[PDB]
Symmetry: D2
Subunit: 238 residues, 4 copies
């Protein structure tokens, strides 16, 4: 009910239907979505937590305006937060079951690669990549860490598979997935070996793949900008 | 503005322990408690979810977040890691002449809190100026996204920079530890000026571990000090 | 002449012709290499600095014995030393000329690769990889750092290009990731991101350890193609 | 080795380089060096070569040796390398683990170092700290149980200015240096704590930061106390 309200409202913000700087109010938003006030209230609050809306001082909400600096900083925060989770898992240790689970996801991700450099199941990688980053966040067994890492990924343009959309299935991106999969293996290896410094460094570097993919799209493939939701609304971008 | 007296009153009742961890809150029962209308109560319950004091229940309603010792240790870790990011980015990107003069002035004022003997420290003066230093450090790299994320990491009562420095916890062991902490403040600024991001990050992370060291000293050696420290009311 | 004596002496140690525990003396070594004593003296001293020989009290050298732990530790030290050079270059800054030179090496390394990994210049990569690691060591402009980094890379089994016949499908695929690391080190140095520059340079040295561990577990016939590796007991 | 003519020449020749008797930039040849030490040609050749391996001399392209010259930049870079090498030993000890006996030994040195401090900020046994500080850094290098790593930290700490207690000589016992020892002792405690807790990242970061104290103390002598330069037996090698 409330979840269905979040999806539609998020879609209207990211499409540019509700532009940056636009003021949103409980009743006018409920009329727009043709949904009851209770789910709409949950949706507006959830999208504030997610970072798409800001609260206005006298009540109501405002659609946030993002710059390139915001995208780069969001990717940085996510990498730094995932690096913390990986380091703490290596320092504290991981349970037999949790390790078996994440190692199974890495093995499934290996099945997305073939003989030629381009032979990669892009859609299969993107779905399993989300699972790997979820399991990595929970690895150290801390709810506080899991919540803070998940919040850092909820943030705009900070999702692990955000720069891997189905329609951005290009050669240059498929070749870069082999290096990314080697990073997943290295994070788990470092955690097993109790090498916190390595686990953190690899997780931070791994997040920077998103920034490289973004920079590739601006300089070499600008038609791919519209494939990332909301990215074409960032006026700054170039 | 900003949720009014409703958000303030409801936050005060959660932090005092009046509304304990695990307690379920609903629109109507909360409105009866605050003797306010439904609209300002709905804003308050939503705002405190965004702030991280409440969690949403799957079938509607809210639940007061419960915190344990592990949560305090992890919050201090996240704060250090976030401050370390701000310090590293300030060193990598560079800092404006005005912003550097401001932070360096706070460090100079903090130096005036120290005397001849190891215990000769103005504890209340350090705590107030320490809050300013950490605020200024968060804004140094010039990024709003970083400043917001660092301030959020510092927002819980026990994750605050001066949280483990309350006026009544003015003990000898804690005054001796402030000299090392002040040397860390100087080192963070020096590393930023020198464009040494790695050092700036490492010092900021280590500096935050002082809070954990001071917390661990209480649990083991002075448990009567637990009640005096804010945030430790949300703990069991 | 002295450099020629070092190559010939190093080759006999790494082939196992001069086994570990063997005692070497100026005269007997000069008779063996059929070279004058002065270049042989330089060679014996240079190989002590490099870590292949140990000095005996009273003169004379002894050929060192190496274990897998020695290889693992050498690679660790090299990565840590290269990470220092990369971090200091990012923190201090690099001159326009030095940055153009190292970036030209990276561009030449790209020409070792095509569209596919089927035809990748393995011998070409190894030669240019040595140049990249030489320039990276000198980037921060410190002679002290350059000397300590080159020493850490002279060390046994620590060399950056640690294999003409060992040219398999897998080791060719791993050179693409290694080249992306070279690009990332330079990018981090340009961007003044010391932390990143250090982390990438450390992780880059670990590729050697990963490739060593692959041969032992999956391709032991490739052990004889690595110089001196066939002498270690594991 | 000290009893051999070869070993005796290394001790005497090292002493003349470190005293400044043989200054930086001085070309040393087999003959001139042998006349100086009044020793035969063969032990001199061993001596000259051993000090090149040691890093005190450099080889000249057309034959012969040159006394290696050191500048302020070289001292700063040497302290950086030592911190980076000690940080590696501390990180590897935390990652691998340390035996019960080795931990009890280093923790005993930390406890002995705590006995060097009193009530006032200046109340510090400077000579007692310097001797025990050498033991702590010795014990720290060996902690991970790797011989190559121990040797590598040993080498990084071998130049007279790259030594852990080099910037703590008996004659440089000043107020501004005694106050800095309290922070340094807290870092010794933090390195051991990080190793026990298996926190390699922290162990490395603290060991690197700890080494920067030596740079801070050096910079203080140059900018504020230049009369202290000559009384540090280790800064004699410095040109400018
Ligand atoms: Zn991933
Ligand atoms: Zn502080
Ligand atoms: Zn390379
Ligand atoms: Zn020390």
């Amino acid at each position: 009910h409330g979840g269905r309200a979040v999806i539609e409202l998020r879609e209207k913000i990211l499409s540019g239907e509700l532009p940056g700087g636009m003021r949103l109010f409980e009743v006018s938003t409920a009329e727009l979505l043709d949904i009851s006030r209770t789910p709409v209230r949950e949706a507006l609050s959830r999208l504030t937590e997610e970072g798409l809306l800001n609260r206005l001082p006298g009540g109501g909400f405002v659609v946030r305006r993002f710059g390139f600096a915001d995208v780069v900083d969001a990717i940085e925060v996510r990498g730094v937060m995932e690096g913390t989770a990986a380091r703490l898992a290596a320092e504290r240790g991981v349970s037999k079951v949790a390790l078996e689970e994440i190692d199974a996801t890495v093995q499934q991700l290996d099945l997305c690669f073939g003989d030629r450099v381009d032979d990669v199941d892009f859609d299969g990688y993107a779905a399993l990549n989300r699972i790997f980053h979820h399991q990595l966040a929970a690895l150290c067994g801390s709810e506080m860490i899991r919540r803070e890492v998940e919040r850092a990924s909820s943030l705009p343009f900070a999702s692990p598979s955000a720069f891997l959309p189905d329609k951005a299935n290009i050669g240059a991106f498929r070749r870069s997935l082999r290096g990314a999969q080697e990073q997943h293996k290295a994070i788990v290896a470092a955690i097993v070996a109790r090498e916190g410094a390595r686990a953190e460094a690899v997780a931070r570097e791994h997040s920077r793949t998103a920034r490289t993919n973004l920079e590739y799209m601006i300089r070499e493939a600008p038609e791919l900008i519209a494939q990332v939701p909301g990215l074409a609304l960032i006026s700054d971008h170039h």
